[PDB]
């Protein structure tokens, strides 16, 4: 569960950083 | 080969094993209780985190 | 840059993160500009689409709402290549969602040109994908006022026979849908071609597709009578069953006397589906047919059916109960009841079920004395399954038919059930006893039942004592604590001294059960002494159960 | 420590009542508890007045459910199962698991006896091994259940005057003292008194005979009559061989055979039967047919 949560959070923040670009 | 000295050494060593083993059991038990407590707390924190994240997504 | 991160998230190993990326294409759409969206994501969602079939479908679904973020109609062409590459997929539902998104997104001249292009793509596929792209191009040209009228007609005619049994079945089954968006002249020519294909339907699934096309024609398309005659000729076992499938829709519409005749004929394995459809046909007839034209066909079908099948007979009886008053219906009901007396148990089941509609027709209280004998002999047969079903039906008809009507005789039946051997029968008896008391009030209860069971509380077979215990357990719920503490409680406390340990720990169970019903003072005065006394027993089970009763209430 | 595993067992039984088996670890702990319970039972067990005797079951679990539906639920009705639980049926594992779970939970309300098909050899041949493997991908279950079968009491004695046992009786056995003086903690030997109790069967030819089955003998009437008289029994009940009526009265009301597995031999298509010993030791039989599939 922790691994899944960390993975989805990383993907979300990656998309947010893409928005930043 | 059965004999009283052997039996006594057997009971002594075996009782010692049972006691040290129950001790290791108790220490590992408390360890696992605290471990799952911490991991459940981390799951709850990540839940509040995902809630805040969807809130910010709706906000932005 | 956005296309790149889309590919990377689509290159993710986990199906869940990728599925999130799928659910998050709107994020990239809002990121880019609508012009940049159309210019970039459309080539991307056209070329670079490779994932799980479920994820491909999810992409198609997320695309189904992309007729706006591209720029509207003036760019529908730019949306057509990808759907084409998604209309040629091997999985049926994926290209089906593709056709749905095409019809959703389809200035429609570019969509029409690309629809002729999708018809060209269908020319390559020699399977149901041809019919899929054809149905797509149909609506895509209809968005441009069906400019591809001759093209749509030719596509339907080619799907009528294109060495593609899949696409041929699709055409011969849903020409009414694929040629619906096509031009009226194109639709009529495709209807002629569909009649030709249904005549050309040779296999069994071909016969089912032909029956479906004939039903769609008789629904939407003397021409009606001519098509109906062709369908009836095609309908008179495998092909006969596939045609009986739509025989009900044929009779569900003078325009049906031939259909009702065919239904009464084919049913007299094809007969099984025939009578299945004849259930709905009889419903529609009794609801719509004219009494003059009814009488003859009704009597013929009644004589035929009275000779699964019983289920259709009961359905037709309940439907024809829509007649105001028919002595012939009374004769049919009497015959069916005498049948259910000596036949499969399902006969009696369906008969007592439709007894509601029977009483709705005239009032089953009249015919009561007619059905009563059957009832009693259905309550005393060998196979305990039958007696069980009869018990299950008993409270419905009892509370349906007043107290005194049953209290004369049927009370003896409830008793005979309570004393029976087969445990399931006793259980059903107690449950329906609770239903009866709920419907007939505690006055009738205390006057009629409770004395009888409390008398039953003493007899050799300890099963025939625990049954009284269970009756008490289930009566306490509704009989109200007054009558309980007046009559039930004394007997329970007394049975608490039975020799058999089973009786004793069931006493404990029932005491724990009816505890909350009772008064706290009554509890502490009466039952707690008995409870601890039981806990002082030697049987470990009765000890455990008494301890449970204590810790659940005391 | 006590009510907790009781609740666990109740949950197990409830799960089992839906053809839903247990995990091999659950089966392991269950068989351990059942060994602990069975070790306190003589080779000839005594059961109080009211019971319900049922015989050959043979893994027909849905028919066992039908049985329970006929004769009452588990704790309410006292049962007595005379062996042959697991083979020639698909739900062997579920059947034996349920019966053992009951015996562990209500150790006083139910009693299970050893049977011909409780030896490792016969199971390995006739199928219980195959279902153990299919449903578990192991033999650990089939090991546990056999090491448990090696403890089941051989016989039961209801109200000191009804003798219940799978199979029949043997020449090396003259009185219940003899049976009670055996060693039942072993696998069924190929020849002995055990290989006859669980293998013999009555017949017409008086005196002993040769069993066409290959093990045990075929005790005639006189054998049973003298056995009853010399032991004070009023009736010997058994269940080892198919009886299409459901229950047969062999040797002039001295021996009863009660098959309790319906539609066992499909060419015959028998109906199962069980016997009820009421509060006054009066027997009354219930014949039932296979459940509706
Ligand atoms: Mn057997």
DSSP assignments along D233-256, one per residue: -SEEEE--S--TTSEEEETTTTEE
Secondary structure of C157-206 in the HEC alphabet?
Answer: HHHHCCCCHHHHHHHHHHHHHHCCCCCHHHHHHHHHHHHHHHHCCCCHHH
Number of domains in chain C: 1
CA distance D99 to D112: 8
Q: B and D: touch, per 3+ CB pairs < 8 A?
A: no
Tokens coding C225: 């009578």
SS3 C499: coil
Residue D265 in tokens:
């031999």
C70 SS3 class: coil
* Superfamily of the domain at D2-288: Metallo-dependent phosphatases (3.60.21.10)
* C258 CB neighbour count, 10 Å cutoff: 15
Under a CB-based contact definition with an 8 Å cutoff, are residues C117 and C80 in contact? Answer: yes
Cβ-defined contact of A1 to B43 (cutoff 8 Å): yes
Q: What is the CA radius of gyration of chain B?
A: 25
Using a CB-CB cut-off of 8 Å, the residues of chain A touching B43 are: 1-2, 5
**Residue D58: closest CA among D106, D16, D94, D32:** D94
- Asked if residues C93 and C131 have their Cβ atoms less than 8 Å apart, the reply is no
Q: Give the burial class of D143: count Cβ atoms within 10 A of its Cβ; 0-12 exposed, 13-18 middle, 19 or more buried.
A: middle
Confirm whether residue D116 is marked as ligand binding.
yes
Give the distance (Å) from ligand 1 centre to CA of residue D251: 20
Residue C412, exposed/middle/buried by CB under 10 A (0-12, 13-18, 19+)?
middle
**DSSP label at D219?**
-
3+ Cβ–Cβ pairs closer than 8 Å linking D and A: no
Q: How far apart are the first and last CA of chain A?
A: 30
Sort out which chain D residues have CB atoms less than 8 A from C541's CB and list them. 75, 106, 108-109
Q: Is the CB of A9 less than 8 angstroms away from the CB of B42?
A: no
**D10 token code pair:** 């109740």
Spell C117-150 as b/e; 16+ CB within 10 A means b.
bbbebbeebebbbbbbbbbbbbbbbbbbebbbbe
Beta carbons within 8 Å of C355's beta carbon, 6+ residues apart: C364, C371, C397, C400
CA–CA distances in Å: residue B4 to residues A21, B9, C221: 83, 9, 104
Rg (C-alpha) for chain D, rounded Å, is 18
Question: Is C466 close to D289, i.e. CB distance below 8 A?
Answer: no
Buried b (16+ CB within 10 A) or exposed e, C510-534: bbbbbbebbeeeebeebbeebbeeb
From the list D62, D117, D229, D251, the catalytic residue is: D117
Chosen for mutation from B37, B46, B47, B51 (greatest number of chain A CBs closer than 10 Å) is B46
Q: How close, in Å, is residue C384 to chain D by CA atoms?
A: 9
Nearest-CB residue to D71 (from C423, C462, C500): C423
Residues contacting residue C362 through CB under 8 Å, at least 6 positions apart: C325, C330
Q: Are C132 and C99 in contact (CB under 8 A)?
A: yes
Annotated catalytic residue D190: no
Beta-carbon separation of A2 and B49 below 8 A: no
* B49/A9 Cβ within 8 A: yes
SS3 C496: coil
Is D182 within 8 Å of D43 (Cβ atoms)? yes
In 10 A of CB C501, how many CB atoms? 21
Q: Does A11 reach chain C within 8 Å, measured CB to CB? A: yes
Q: b/e for D47-56, b at 16 or more Cβ within 10 A?
A: beebbbbbbb
Breakpoints of chain B, after residues (C–N > 2.5 Å): none
CA distance D76 to chain C (A): 6
Q: Measuring CA to CA, which residue among D256, D52, D257 is closest to residue C423? A: D52
What 8-state DSSP symbol labels residue C526? I
Alpha-helical segments (H) within C267-344: 270-288, 291-306, 309-319, 327-341
Residue with tokens 């198919």: D242
Task: Return the structure tokens found at D40.
Answer: 């306190």
Contact of chains A and B by CB distance (3 or more pairs under 8 angstroms) = yes
Q: Which domain holds residue C139?
A: 1-553
Q: Quote the CA–CA distance of D48 and D110 in Å, as a whole number.
A: 11
Ligand-binding site membership of D56 (annotated): yes
- How many CA atoms are closer than 13 Å to the CA of C495, on its beta-carbon side? 33
Gyration radius of chain A's alpha carbons: 9
No. of H helices and E strands in chain D?
10, 11
Q: Angle D81-D86-D91 (CA atoms, 0-180°, nearest 5)?
A: 110
Q: Residue C16 and residue A15: Cβ atoms within 8 Å?
A: no
Q: How far is CA C544 from CA C15, C130, D79, in A?
A: 52, 72, 20
* Runs of H (alpha helix) within A1-21: 2-20
Method: cryo-EM
* Residue C237 Cα to ligand 1 middle (Å): 45
- Strand positions, DSSP E, chain D: 44-47, 51-54, 79-82, 110-113, 155-158, 162-164, 235-238, 247-250, 255-258, 272-277, 283-288
Strands (E), C469-518: none
Alpha-carbon C327 to chain mean position: 34
Q: Is beta strand D162-164 parallel, antiparallel or unpaired with respect to D235-238?
A: parallel
In angstroms, the CA B60 to CA C434 distance is 61
| Beta carbons of C122 and C114 less than 8 angstroms apart | no
Rounded Cα distance between D130 and D86, Å, is 11
Rg (CA), chain C: 35
CA-to-CA distance for C518 and C127, rounded, in angstroms? 74
Which residues of chain A are within 8 Å of residue C5 when distances are taken between CB atoms? Answer: 14-15, 18
What does DSSP assign to residue C446?
A: H
Q: What is the CATH number of the domain that holds C440?
A: 1.25.10.10
Residue C542 and residue C475: Cα distance in Å, rounded?
Answer: 23
Bridge partners (DSSP) listed for residue D284: D276
Q: Resolution (in Å) of the shown entry?
A: 3.3
**Which phi and psi angles does C356 have, rounded to 5°?**
-60, -55
């Amino acid at each position: 569960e922790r691994k899944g949560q960390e993975n989805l959070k990383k993907d979300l923040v990656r998309r947010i950083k893409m928005l930043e670009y | 080969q059965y004999t009283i000295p052997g039996i006594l050494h057997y009971i002594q060593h075996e009782w010692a094993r049972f006691e040290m083993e129950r001790a290791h059991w108790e220490v590992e038990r408390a360890e696992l209780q605290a471990r799952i407590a911490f991991l459940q707390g981390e799951r709850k924190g990540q839940e509040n985190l995902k809630k805040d994240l969807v809130r910010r997504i709706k906000m932005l | 840059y956005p296309i790149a991160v889309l590919i990377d998230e689509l290159r993710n190993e986990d199906v869940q993160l990728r599925l999130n990326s799928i659910k998050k294409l709107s994020t990239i759409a809002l990121a880019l500009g609508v012009e940049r969206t159309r210019s970039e994501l459309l080539p991307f969602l056209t070329d670079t689409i490779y994932d799980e079939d479920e994820v491909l479908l999810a992409l198609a679904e997320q695309l189904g709402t992309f007729t706006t973020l591209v720029g509207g109609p003036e760019y529908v062409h730019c949306l057509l290549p990808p759907l084409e590459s998604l209309a040629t997929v091997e999985e049926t539902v994926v290209r089906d969602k593709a056709v749905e998104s095409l019809r959703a997104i389809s200035p429609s001249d570019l969509e029409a040109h690309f629809v002729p292009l999708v018809k060209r793509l269908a020319g390559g596929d020699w399977f149901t994908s041809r019919t899929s792209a054809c149905g797509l191009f149909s609506v895509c040209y209809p968005r441009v006022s069906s400019a591809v009228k001759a093209e749509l007609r030719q596509y339907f005619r080619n799907l009528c026979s294109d060495d593609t049994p899949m696409v041929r079945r699709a055409a011969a089954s849903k020409l009414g849908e694929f040629a619906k968006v096509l031009e009226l002249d194109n639709v009529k020519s495709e209807i002629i071609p569909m009649f030709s294909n249904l005549a050309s339907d040779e296999q069994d699934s071909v016969r089912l597709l032909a029956v479906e096309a004939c039903v769609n024609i008789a629904q939407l398309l003397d021409l009606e009578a001519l098509v109906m005659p062709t369908l009836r000729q095609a309908a008179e076992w495998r092909v006969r069953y596939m045609v009986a499938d739509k025989f009900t829709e044929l009779q569900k519409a003078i325009t049906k006397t031939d259909l009702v005749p065919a239904f009464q004929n084919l049913m007299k394995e094809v007969r099984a589906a025939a009578s299945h459809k004849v259930k709905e046909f009889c419903e529609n007839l009794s609801a719509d047919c004219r009494e003059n034209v009814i009488m003859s066909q009704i009597l013929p079908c009644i004589k035929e059916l009275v000779s699964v099948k019983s289920a259709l007979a009961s359905v037709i009886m309940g439907l024809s109960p829509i007649l105001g008053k028919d002595n012939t219906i009374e004769h049919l009901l009497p015959l069916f009841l005498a049948q259910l007396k000596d036949e499969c148990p399902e006969v009696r089941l369906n008969i007592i079920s439709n007894l509601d509609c029977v009483n709705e027709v005239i009032g089953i209280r009249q015919l009561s004395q007619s059905l009563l004998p059957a009832i009693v002999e259905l309550a005393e047969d060998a196979k305990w399954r039958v007696r069980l079903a009869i018990i299950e039906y008993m409270p419905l008809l009892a509370g349906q038919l007043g107290v005194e009507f049953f209290d004369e005789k049927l009370n003896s039946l409830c008793m005979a059930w309570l004393v029976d051997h087969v445990y399931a029968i006793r259980e059903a008896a107690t449950s329906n006893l609770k239903k009866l008391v709920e419907k007939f009030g505690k006055e009738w209860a205390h006057a009629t039942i409770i004395p009888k069971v409390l008398a039953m509380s003493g007899d050799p077979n300890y099963l025939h004592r625990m049954t009284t215990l269970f009756c008490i357990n289930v009566l306490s719920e509704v009989c109200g604590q007054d009558i309980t503490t007046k009559h039930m409680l004394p007997t329970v406390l007394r049975m608490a001294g039975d020799p058999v340990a089973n009786v004793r720990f069931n006493v404990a169970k029932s005491l724990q059960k009816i505890g909350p019903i009772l008064d706290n003072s009554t509890l502490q005065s009466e039952v707690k002494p008995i409870l601890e006394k039981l806990t002082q027993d030697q049987d470990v089970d009765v000890k455990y159960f008494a301890q449970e009763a204590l810790t659940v209430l005391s | 420590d006590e009510k907790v595993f009781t609740k666990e067992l109740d949950q197990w039984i409830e799960q089992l009542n839906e053809c839903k088996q247990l995990s091999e670890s659950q089966v392991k702990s269950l068989c351990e508890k059942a060994k602990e319970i069975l070790t306190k039972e003589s080779n000839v067990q005594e059961v109080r007045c009211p019971v319900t005797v049922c015989g050959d079951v043979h893994g027909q679990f849905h028919d066992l459910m039908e049985l329970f539906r006929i004769g009452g639920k588990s704790p309410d009705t006292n049962y007595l199962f005379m062996g042959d639980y697991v083979d020639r049926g698909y739900y062997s594992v579920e059947t034996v698991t349920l019966l053992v779970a009951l015996k562990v939970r209500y150790r006083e309300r139910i009693t299970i006896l050893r049977g011909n098909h409780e030896s490792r050899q016969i199971t390995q041949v006739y199928g219980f091994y195959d279902e153990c493997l299919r449903k578990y991908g192991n033999a650990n279950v089939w090991k546990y259940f056999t090491d448990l079968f090696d403890y089941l009491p051989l016989t039961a004695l209801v109200d000191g005057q009804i003798f219940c046992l799978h199979g029949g009786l043997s020449p090396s056995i003259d009185t219940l003292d003899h049976i009670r003086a055996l060693d039942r903690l072993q696998e069924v030997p190929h020849e002995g008194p055990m290989c006859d109790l669980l293998w013999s069967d009555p017949d017409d030819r008086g005196g002993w005979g040769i069993s066409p089955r290959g093990a045990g003998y075929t005790f005639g009437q006189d054998i049973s009559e003298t056995f009853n008289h010399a032991n004070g029994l009023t009736l010997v009940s058994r269940a080892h061989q198919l009886v299409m009526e459901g229950y047969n009265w062999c040797h002039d009301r001295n021996v009863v055979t009660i098959f309790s597995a319906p539609n066992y031999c499909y060419r015959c298509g028998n109906q199962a039967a069980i016997m009820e010993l009421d509060d006054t030791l009066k027997y009354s039989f219930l014949q039932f047919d296979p459940a509706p599939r």
